[PDB]
Structure formats: structure tokens, C-alpha cells
């Protein structure tokens, strides 16, 4: 019996009254449009935006902490080298804005040096992420923005083939250029090569080298695209699993352990992978939201009272939209809880509080590599956790409105079925 229900659950009686009233249904649909703008059209006040940003900064931060400690070297085919130094610019090396790959004789691989092939793949993702963070990420609904990215590396030493025609695609080592394209979007890449002799003036390093410049135009800076870059960054590290050893700075924070393999940070890498996975799922709700616009008013037909049993074909879409928004909100929350130091324990808590949520740069803007970036995240991790919480706090009303819109629609789908 139903009077008996609506006695103990009077909240349910109100819900049914609201579901029979086009004017309350339309109000709930307006609210869904406004909370959608907040989630996918805004930046500072979008929980969704803040969690995407957090997932990306945690990946970048992880490399800013450990990159300088990581062995790399060898030649182009993942082969060991006899005497190859390959240096990657705008990377957070030890007291330096470059990372030097100069480990010879050892075969590249697991618990050894990172091959130059993996490092190139890693470095490209890093430079793209850093350029995008620096310019500022766009709102989740902006899917056709692009950024330009430029980066350089150098090869020296007898036998070093990491800047060759085969590694690069460029015909003449001195002055040559090659253009290739790639992928929904066309990304154009221009690669250029130059040779600097050992004696040339303005060559302080005492040796001959080849320089490769890569210029990428039309790089997508959408959230989905950047998360894919962050995933590439962290997965390359985890799969290559190179040896590292840290300079334990004889003063404050202490790295645990000091020698080892990079994938030995299992809790940290898992957490970051899980953040990225959750932010990807979160950003996928965007198209669910766009596909089920809630802006048309609903309300009977033929000047005849609204009938919740027959006239509610729109309910399916309203439910899917409301559910997609709630899911965004919850995933955004899950992202923050994966990395928030308040709920973390031991080794993993030290890593985040002592290194990842720290910056040693003399705030400097996002995406800036200095000679003191190494061993600190320098990716605004603490500020982002804080802004995620601030934005969740300012989403109180909207979350209730979304749950109400979902309940209304769910009632109409039940009645229609």
C-alpha cells in the first residue's frame, strides 16, 4: 500500500508531486544546464577541471622529482653504446635545465638505463605537458584548442647515432629539415638538424655535437589529449623501469629508497595511473552531457494536463545527463582522495609531502624548469588539492540540484516503463 509508504518517507511524497509538475521539471532542467556550464565551461570553480589538472600535475611532478636520478644512455636501436652522450633540453636535471644520457656499455632495459627511444617518447610528452600547463588548460568543453611546442636535444661522442637520418628522418645533418604529420586532429612536426664543431666560438663545452630541433604545431591541448600525454609519460617510466640513484640532499627531506628501479615506487605509480584513469572517465562524461541537452521546455501536449506516464519521453535523457554530472563530481572527488596526503600512509605519504607537493624553484609560473626543479614536483600539487576542495565546497547547491533532477527523471522513467 502507498499511503503507508509516504507516511515513513515523506520526502518521497514530495518527489512524486514534483514529477507530476512541468514547472518543477523545467526548473530542474534549467538547473542541469547551469551545473553543466559550471562543470565543463568553468575553470577555477569546476571540480572537474581541478581534478583533471591534478592528475596531469601529479604525473609531471613525479618526473620532476626523479628524472635527474634516472640512468639513460645507449644508441638508437635500444642498443648499448661505446661513447654516446645525448642531452635533452628543458628537462629537470641535477643542478641543470638539461638531462644527460651518457651511460655506456650497459644494455638499456629494465633496472638499467633508459633507452633513448623511451626517453624521446617521455621527453616529448613532458614538453607538451609543460607547454600546455604554462599557457593554462582550457575548460573541459574546449576540444579544438592547440598549442605549439619546441624542444631540442644534442648528440656527441664517437659512434653516437641518436641524431642520425635513421633516428630522425632528416637528410643532411647540417642545415636539413623534414616535415611529417600525424594524429581526430592533424599535428605537424618540423625537425631540423645542425652541427656545431668542437672549435666553433660560442662552444664552451669542449666537443663536437649535432643539434636536433623539433617544432610541433597544432598539438591538441584538450583535456582528453593531455591526459593521453600524461598517461604516455607515466607508462613509459613504468614499462622501461630504469635504474635510478638519488643525491640525498644532506639537510631536510630523505628519499626512500636511494638506489633502485623506477617502477619500485609501486604505490606512487599506481596512484598516478589511477588518477589519470579516473580523469579520463570523468572527461568522457562530457559528451554524454552534450548529447542530452536539457534546454527545451517540456509540458503536456494539446493544452492537456501533463501525464507522467505518457508524456515523459525526455526523461531518459535527463537521467543520463544528471547521472553523467554526478559521476563527474564523484570521479573528481576520487582523484583528489587518491593523492591527498591527509589519507596517506608511510613511504607514500613521505613521497608526496616531502617531494611531490613541494617546489624548489625560486610562485614561478606553471611549466617552468629551472636548475633547482629536480627532486621536487614543481607542479602546484598542493595548491591544486586545495582548489579542488574549494570548488567542491562551492558546488554544494548544485550537487543537490543534480541529485534532485536525477530522482525526478528516474521517477518518470519508472512511470513510463
Amino acid at each position: 500500500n502507498l499511503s503507508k509508504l509516504l507516511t515513513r518517507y515523506s520526502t518521497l511524497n514530495t518527489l512524486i508531486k514534483l514529477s507530476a509538475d512541468p514547472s518543477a521539471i523545467n526548473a530542474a532542467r534549467e538547473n542541469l544546464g547551469a551545473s553543466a556550464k559550471n562543470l565543463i565551461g568553468d575553470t577555477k570553480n569546476s571540480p572537474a577541471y581541478q581534478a583533471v589538472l591534478l592528475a596531469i600535475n601529479a604525473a609531471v611532478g613525479f618526473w620532476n622529482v626523479l628524472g635527474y636520478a634516472t640512468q639513460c644512455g645507449g644508441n638508437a636501436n635500444g642498443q648499448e653504446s661505446t661513447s654516446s652522450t645525448t642531452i635533452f633540453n628543458n628537462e629537470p636535471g641535477y643542478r641543470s635545465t638539461s638531462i644527460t644520457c651518457s651511460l655506456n656499455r650497459y644494455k638499456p632495459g629494465y633496472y638499467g638505463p633508459m633507452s633513448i627511444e623511451n626517453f624521446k617518447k617521455l621527453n616529448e610528452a613532458y614538453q607538451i605537458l609543460q607547454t600546455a600547463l604554462n599557457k593554462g588548460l582550457p575548460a573541459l568543453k574546449e576540444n579544438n584548442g592547440t598549442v605549439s611546442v619546441t624542444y631540442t636535444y644534442t648528440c656527441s661522442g664517437e659512434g653516437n647515432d641518436n641524431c642520425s637520418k635513421k633516428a630522425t628522418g632528416v637528410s643532411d645533418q647540417n642545415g636539413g629539415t623534414k616535415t611529417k604529420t600525424q594524429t581526430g586532429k592533424t599535428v605537424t612536426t618540423k625537425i631540423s638538424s645542425k652541427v656545431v664543431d668542437s672549435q666553433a666560438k660560442g662552444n664552451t663545452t669542449r666537443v663536437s655535437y649535432t643539434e636536433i630541433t623539433n617544432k610541433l604545431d597544432g598539438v591538441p591541448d584538450s583535456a582528453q589529449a593531455l591526459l593521453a600525454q600524461a598517461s604516455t609519460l607515466i607508462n613509459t617510466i613504468n614499462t622501461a623501469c630504469p635504474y635510478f640513484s638519488v643525491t640525498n640532499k644532506s639537510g631536510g627531506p630523505q628519499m626512500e629508497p636511494t638506489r633502485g628501479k623506477l617502477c619500485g615506487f609501486t604505490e606512487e605509480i599506481s596512484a598516478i595511473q589511477k588518477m589519470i584513469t579516473d580523469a579520463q572517465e570523468l572527461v568522457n562524461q562530457t559528451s554524454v552531457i552534450n548529447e542530452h541537452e536539457q534546454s527545451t521546455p517540456v509540458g503536456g501536449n494539446n493544452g492537456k494536463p501533463f501525464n507522467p506516464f505518457t508524456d515523459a519521453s525526455f526523461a531518459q535523457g535527463m537521467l543520463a545527463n544528471a547521472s553523467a554530472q554526478a559521476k563527474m563530481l564523484n570521479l573528481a572527488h576520487q582523484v583528489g582522495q587518491t593523492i591527498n596526503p591527509d589519507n596517506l600512509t608511510g613511504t607514500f605519504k613521505n613521497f608526496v609531502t616531502g617531494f611531490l607537493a613541494t617546489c624548489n624553484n625560486k610562485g614561478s609560473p606553471p611549466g617552468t624548469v629551472t636548475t633547482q626543479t629536480f627532486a621536487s614536483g614543481c607542479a602546484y600539487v598542493e595548491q591544486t588539492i586545495t582548489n579542488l576542495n574549494n570548488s567542491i565546497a562551492h558546488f554544494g547547491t548544485q550537487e543537490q540540484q543534480i541529485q534532485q533532477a536525477e530522482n525526478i527523471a528516474d521517477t518518470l522513467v519508472n512511470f513510463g516503463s
Epitope: 554526478a326 589519507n343 558546488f395 554544494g396
Partner: nanobody, 113 residues
Framework: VQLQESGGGLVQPGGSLRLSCAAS????????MGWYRQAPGKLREWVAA???????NYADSVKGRFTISRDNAKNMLYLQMSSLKPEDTALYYC????????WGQGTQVTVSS
Amino acid sequence: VQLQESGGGLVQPGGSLRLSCAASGSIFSGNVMGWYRQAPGKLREWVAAITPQGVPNYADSVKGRFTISRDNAKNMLYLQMSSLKPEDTALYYCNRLPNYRSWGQGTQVTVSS
């Protein structure tokens, strides 16, 4: 698992009440927390919230009269209510934001002359 509000009662307009919520560590620790209320004939309405670092914010209907606070050592959430009006009559509830799917029992506040 656990949200448990207390402190409600019948009061006079102009009056004060202090509500409490004892929350489990799971729910409370490192989470935004807040207060909600459900008045006769209406659905649940958000009322106030506070970040882990203690920044409060309020719905317009209670701003300047209610104060939300948190005690991080004891997993406690509080809502000090002043200048109460009949319109504040409701079942008051606390939860994290975003909400844990199971609500506590609430605490009744009635404001009446």
C-alpha cells in the same frame, strides 16, 4: 559508515542552537564536510560547507547567522545557529561533499513562539 547528528530541539525565534555531527574517519578525514536540511514539503537543501583547512561557505538563506566549524582531531562537525526563524524549522543532516550515499538519522530543529 557513520554520520550521527545531535543538538536539535524546539526553540524560540531569536534563539540559538549548536548542532553536532560525529563522523567516522573514512568520511571526514581530508574531505569537505557540510550541513543540509530538509523542511516540511521540500526536498533536502544544502546549507553550509567547510574545507579540511577550515574555509567555510554558506547558502544565502543562512549567511551571516550560522557558523560552521570542524574539529580535525575528533572528527566533529558543528553548526552554530543564531537569530533563528520559523523558516529554519527542519531535519538537519551532515555529510561529506560529495555525499556519502547513506544519510544519518538527522536532528530535528523546530523554531516556534
